[PDB]
Amino acid sequence: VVSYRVPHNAAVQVYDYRAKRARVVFGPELVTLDPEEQFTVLSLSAGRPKR
Amino acid sequence: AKLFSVPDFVGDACKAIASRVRGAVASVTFDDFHKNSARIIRMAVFGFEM
Structure with a gap:
C-alpha cells in the first residue's frame, strides 16, 4: 500500500x-490510496527571495 | 485543535510583533524612539485606546 x-x-x-470519484481530506489523516488513486503533487515556491 | 492552526506560532508571533513595532517606530524620530522607547514600542504592538 502507498x-x-x-x-x-x-x-x-x-x-x-x-471509481470515478473525487475526495480531498484535510487535517491529520492517513490516506490510503486505492490501486488507481493518485496524489496531488504540488510544486511550490521556495528559496530565500522566491523561486 | 485551533492551537495547532499555525505550525510555527513562535515565528508567527515574532514576525507580527517585529513588523508592527518597526512600522510604528518608522513614524517617530530617533529622539522620540529613545525618550518614549518602551512606551511607543508597547503601543506599537497593540495600538489602540482603552
Whole structure:
C-alpha cells in the first residue's frame, strides 16, 4: 500500500481513477490510496527571495 | 485543535510583533524612539485606546 501521513494543518487531494470519484481530506489523516488513486503533487515556491 | 492552526506560532508571533513595532517606530524620530522607547514600542504592538 502507498499511504501518506498528512500533517495536521494540511490537506491532500486524491482521485480514484478506478471509481470515478473525487475526495480531498484535510487535517491529520492517513490516506490510503486505492490501486488507481493518485496524489496531488504540488510544486511550490521556495528559496530565500522566491523561486 | 485551533492551537495547532499555525505550525510555527513562535515565528508567527515574532514576525507580527517585529513588523508592527518597526512600522510604528518608522513614524517617530530617533529622539522620540529613545525618550518614549518602551512606551511607543508597547503601543506599537497593540495600538489602540482603552
